[PDB]
Design a protein around this ligand. Structure first.
Ligand SMILES: Oc1ccc2[nH]ccc2c1
Length: 339
């Protein structure tokens, strides 16, 4: 489909130019006011900030260099920033600035006030198939884009999908994203979403993203993921088993697509066959999807999140507000030279 071919060729050209000459050091911390903590983790946080001169709001991801090193995430954090500064797609959150200081790494991203898909899904219970399909189509196109650039995303889950002011998806958190020719081996992701070949410590490829899409679509339409249990090891046993149970309310088309995405044999899994993404795009479950209209954001969304303005934090939850401390001495300078 020459139109798609030429689109992806241009996309790769533009990505490669930025990939080979990454931007660095494009703002500093005291250009911003701190507003609110939007999320936390073992080695970083995300803050709502306001730029003091323009008044624009942003989501600032702050990574503690010493904790990144301790938790063996050095290459991953370098991956995240190098990839984010080089990509450009309607459903990827934009990196606006990055910089580092003696203690931390900073990625300043567009602020998406609608919150995580996770919150909306848990609030409503489950999405109707048209609603799930609207979001799934955006992920399909996003993975078509990323995979053409030799990128694997490796962290698809509802918490990483923000809903924007038009009700479209913005993918965030490229902490496990990686440029991979051939195979890669790192154990990473979230247990419920891991493909069998990750669990079994194999060399794996982009097929793991298509498996995760199967998990996401199931969870969106059912309200719960297909492989669920108290301990990860019990989850992993279900994932590798080759068995999935579908709610009776699922359409036959949905069940058929999901059996082909949740295919334990990665050599038979949709997205990893000779026809690539088109086995998914042409599946009957997507028969009502106008792929170009989705890309162009011309489809009316299933819902618009409720929020009062670009500074509204109501769709995110409350965390202890901790200091952003910057040591008087540089930490881990060598490890993060390229950031
Ligand atoms: O706009 C954004 C971007 C990344 C994020 N991570 C957590 C909240 C959040 C908001």
């Amino acid at each position: 489909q020459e139109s798609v071919k030429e689109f992806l060729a241009k996309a790769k050209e533009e990505f490669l130019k930025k990939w080979e000459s990454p931007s660095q050091n494009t703002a500093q911390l005291d250009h911003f006011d701190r507003i609110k903590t939007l999320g936390t983790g073992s080695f970083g946080r995300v803050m709502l900030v306001k730029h003091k001169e323009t008044g624009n709001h942003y989501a600032m991801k702050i990574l503690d260099k010493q904790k990144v090193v301790k938790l063996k995430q050095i290459e991953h954090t370098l991956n995240e920033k190098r990839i984010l500064q080089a990509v450009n797609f309607p459903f990827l959150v934009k990196l606006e600035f990055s910089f580092k200081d003696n203690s931390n790494l900073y990625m300043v991203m567009e602020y998406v006030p609608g919150g995580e898909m996770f919150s909306h899904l848990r609030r409503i219970g489950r999405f109707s198939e048209p609603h799930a399909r609207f979001y799934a189509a955006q992920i399909v196109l996003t993975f078509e884009y990323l995979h053409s650039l030799d990128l694997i995303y490796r962290d698809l889950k509802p918490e990483n999908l923000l809903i924007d002011q038009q009700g479209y998806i913005q993918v965030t958190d490229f902490g496990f994203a990686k440029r991979v020719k051939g195979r890669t081996w790192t154990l990473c992701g979230t247990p419920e979403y891991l493909a069998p070949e990750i669990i079994l410590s194999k060399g794996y490829n982009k097929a793991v993203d298509w498996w995760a899409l199967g998990v996401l679509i199931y969870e969106m339409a059912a309200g719960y993921p297909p492989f669920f249990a108290d301990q990860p090891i019990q989850i992993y046993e279900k994932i590798v088993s080759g068995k999935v149970r579908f709610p009776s309310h699922f359409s036959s088309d949905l069940k058929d697509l999901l059996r082909n995405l949740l295919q334990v044999d990665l050599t038979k899994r949709f997205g990893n066959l000779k026809n690539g993404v088109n086995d998914i795009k042409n599946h009957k479950w997507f028969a009502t999807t106008d792929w170009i209209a989705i890309y162009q954001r011309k489809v009316e969304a299933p819902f618009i999140p409720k929020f009062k303005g670009p500074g509204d934090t109501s769709n995110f939850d409350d965390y202890e507000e901790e200091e952003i401390r910057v040591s008087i001495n540089e930490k881990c300078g060598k490890e993060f030279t390229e950031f």
